[PDB]
């Protein structure tokens, strides 16, 4: 996250950190995700596409730091890794960039609720907040587009949803943004999501609930003028989610 503040998982208790193991001993961060129900975490397909071997990923819930432990955290294995059928990327956009990970602890259990582990709510069918709404994004992604390391402390920031008309302006993203995407930016192009925040949540309040409105997916640069962050429009994928989380 560019700008923003440093926070603790109690402020985003549904945030999931996904890492990949390497033969050799290291573990590297891959993407963020969100807990939808006790056994399911949703993220973005592009985070797994190049290495879809589930046995090599680890998921942690209740984590405020990247490589050090947080007391209360839970470690999980990926029982099922579901990528979207129709996922495609072009020169910028990723279409149908959503993925599901069914998690299982080494003891055979799913997530358990605590002050650091909570689920986030799903929107109702094609129901979104109106443009203008301020939503928050959280993650361990880059703090500057030139950095080559991720922060150790979790960050959060607030961005506003913008209309498709504004985002599809030729000088923003044009037709690359579709109806299954949402754009969000900072009025002053000061704070934004960046590489590493990928797969994580865009949370807004809908009908009184903190709802997972988007998944961090793509953007040109990070915090660049007239280059909003583009998120997967979760409300348009509910049938697909249902199809696997029944």
């Amino acid at each position: 996250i560019i700008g923003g503040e440093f926070t603790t998982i109690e402020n985003q208790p549904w945030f999931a950190a996904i890492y990949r193991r390497h033969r050799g001993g290291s573990v590297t961060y891959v993407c963020g995700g969100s807990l939808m129900s006790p056994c399911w975490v949703i993220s973005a397909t592009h985070c797994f596409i190049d290495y879809p071997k589930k046995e090599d990923y680890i998921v942690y819930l209740g984590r405020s730091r990247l490589n050090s432990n947080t007391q209360g955290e839970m470690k999980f294995e990926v029982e099922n890794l579901i990528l979207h059928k129709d996922y495609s990327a072009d020169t910028l956009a990723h279409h149908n960039d959503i993925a599901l990970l069914k998690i299982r602890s080494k003891e055979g259990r799913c997530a358990q609720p605590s002050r650091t582990i909570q689920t986030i709510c799903l929107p109702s069918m094609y129901n979104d907040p109106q443009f203008g709404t301020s939503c928050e994004i959280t993650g361990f992604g880059k703090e500057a587009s030139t950095d080559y390391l991720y922060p150790e402390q979790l960050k959060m920031t607030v961005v506003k949803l913008i209309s498709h008309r504004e985002c599809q302006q030729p000088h923003y993203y044009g037709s690359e943004v579709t109806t299954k995407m949402l754009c969000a930016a900072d009025p002053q192009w000061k704070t934004d999501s960046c590489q590493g925040d990928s797969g994580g949540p865009l949370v807004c309040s809908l009908q009184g609930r903190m709802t997972l409105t988007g998944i961090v997916s793509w953007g040109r640069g990070c915090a660049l003028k007239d280059k909003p962050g583009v998120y997967t429009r979760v409300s348009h994928f509910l049938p697909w989610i249902r199809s696997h989380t029944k």
């Binding site: 208790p13 549904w14 909570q118 689920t119």
Partner: peptide
């Protein structure tokens, strides 16, 4: 206790 989606507790 049990999950209540969208609720933070601080």
């Amino acid at each position: 206790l049990k999950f209540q989606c969208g609720q933070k507790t601080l």
